[PDB]
């Protein structure tokens, strides 16, 4: 009508209508199970935050759709079984979601 600015249609309608809130959402769901599976490889230092810090995001050369799961368990076999791994994957695929409107 105007432009796209304000917190009017840019934030406040672009996730009140799904779609938008897919891209935010994904690109945080990914930081919230690094940092919880560095906290069971024990990580330290910039390790840990490496750790973290390159699942979220990426460069569009990263699929996975099901693959975070066979990604994660790559590393901790041993610490954290399906029980856990699926569940923290779902646990966070909702609250990532409301994440996005609730972080405004």
Same mark, same amino acid.
């Given at each position: 009508?105007?432009? @796209?600015?304000? /917190?009017? +249609?840019?934030? !406040?309608?672009? =996730?009140?209508?799904?779609?938008?809130?897919?891209f935010?959402?994904e690109? +945080? +769901?990914?930081?919230? %199970?690094?940092?919880?599976?560095?906290?069971?490889?024990?990580?330290?230092?910039?390790?840990? /935050?490496?750790?973290? %810090?390159?699942?979220?995001?990426?460069? @569009?050369?990263?699929?996975?759709? !099901?693959?975070? =799961?066979r990604?994660?368990?790559?590393?901790? !076999?041993?610490?954290?079984?399906? !029980?856990?791994?699926?569940?923290?994957?779902?646990?966070?695929?909702?609250?990532? +979601?409301?994440?996005?409107?609730?972080?405004?």
């Amino acid at each position: 009508m105007t432009t @796209f600015d304000d /917190r009017e +249609r840019a934030h !406040e309608a672009k =996730f009140a209508h799904d779609a938008e809130l897919n891209f935010k959402a994904e690109a +945080r +769901r990914n930081r919230l %199970l690094g940092e919880w599976a560095a906290g069971l490889l024990g990580k330290t230092g910039d390790d840990a /935050r490496a750790y973290a %810090l390159t699942v979220v995001t990426s460069d @569009f050369d990263e699929p996975g759709d !099901e693959d975070v =799961f066979r990604k994660l368990a790559a590393d901790l !076999e041993g610490k954290a079984d399906e !029980e856990t791994i699926r569940a923290k994957m779902v646990e966070l695929r909702a609250t990532a +979601r409301e994440q996005i409107i609730s972080e405004i």
